[PDB]
Design a protein around this ligand. Structure first.
Ligand SMILES: C[S@@+](CC[C@H](N)C(=O)[O-])C[C@H]1O[C@@H](n2cnc3c(N)ncnc32)[C@H](O)[C@@H]1O
Ligand code: SF4
Ligand SMILES: [K+]
Length: 245
């Protein structure tokens, strides 16, 4: 059986509407976001080993809180798509149970092997992070280029995969007008994008960096003002998508 490495899993009420989301936080990430609120998910060799069978035993205990009206499973992390074969197998079993599936990903897809298409076939919703359209800023904010993520966004559009875009708004890094316009331009013709969700930066998880003995590089940065969230939202709305925060 395929072995997955997970940081943890948790059942949580959906953000809105009834029912619950069973979220598995997969272990391992290859990005280095200065704001990462889950620094302990980076190590690919850490976490706990689990089988799909093990995980489904936990999932089915919440069956009655997952329905068409609300609820399901989410693969998050960490970067779940680094373990695409396991997530595919997991989602395949969730589909046999009639459970809604959501993939929460940074889109850092480096190999387009058949497993990716197979995963998407059993993925109902992709929540895709677009962290910065300006690659010069992206490299300084995340440690890697945004090229792979942008290619994956376009791949999802070509396959008409349902997508929510998520954009973390960080003062001094991703709150400027130009970056917002770039995001609106890039996603405008993606008819598969149901909405753009703006997430205000928060300093949760700083202690996880201190535990590793590493400097948190965004000390002193505060959450964005409501005025800033409204400005970014208004810019994005000019490009025709539903924008929310
Ligand atoms: C831990 S990552 C899990 C999924 C995947 N690793 C990713 O980033 O796309 C849940 C969401 O919160 C965002 N996030 C991470 N740190 C944050 C912070 N300090 N403030 C606000 N959002 C943050 C992530 O960008 C992602 O959109
Ligand atoms: S992609 Fe997600 S888990 Fe990975 S470093 Fe960035 S915020 Fe953290
Ligand atoms: K995401």
């Amino acid at each position: 059986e395929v072995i997955g490495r997970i940081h943890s899993f948790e059942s949580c009420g959906t953000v809105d509407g009834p029912g619950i989301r069973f979220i598995t936080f997969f272990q391992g990430c290859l990005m280095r976001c200065l704001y990462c609120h889950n620094r302990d998910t980076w190590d690919t060799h850490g976490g706990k080993e689990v089988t799909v069978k093990d995980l489904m035993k936990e999932v089915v205990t919440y069956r009655h809180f997952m329905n068409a009206s609300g609820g399901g499973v989410t693969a998050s992390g960490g970067e779940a798509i680094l373990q695409a074969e396991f997530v595919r197998d997991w989602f395949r079993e969730c589909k046999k149970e009639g459970i809604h599936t959501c993939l929460d990903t940074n889109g850092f897809v480096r190999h387009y092997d058949p497993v990716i298409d197979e995963l998407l076939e059993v993925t109902d919703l992709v929540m895709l992070d677009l962290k910065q359209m300006n690659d010069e800023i992206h490299k300084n904010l995340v440690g890697v280029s945004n090229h792979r993520t942008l290619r994956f966004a376009q791949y999802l559009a070509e396959k008409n995969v349902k997508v929510w875009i998520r954009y973390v708004v960080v003062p001094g890094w991703s709150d400027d007008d130009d970056s917002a316009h770039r995001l609106g331009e890039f996603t405008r013709d993606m008819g598969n994008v149901e909405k753009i969700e703006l997430l205000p930066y928060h300093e949760l998880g700083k202690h996880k960096w201190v535990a590793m003995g590493e400097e948190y590089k965004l000390d002193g940065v505060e959450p964005p003002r409501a005025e800033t969230m409204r400005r970014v939202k208004g810019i994005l709305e000019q490009y025709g998508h539903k924008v929310m925060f």
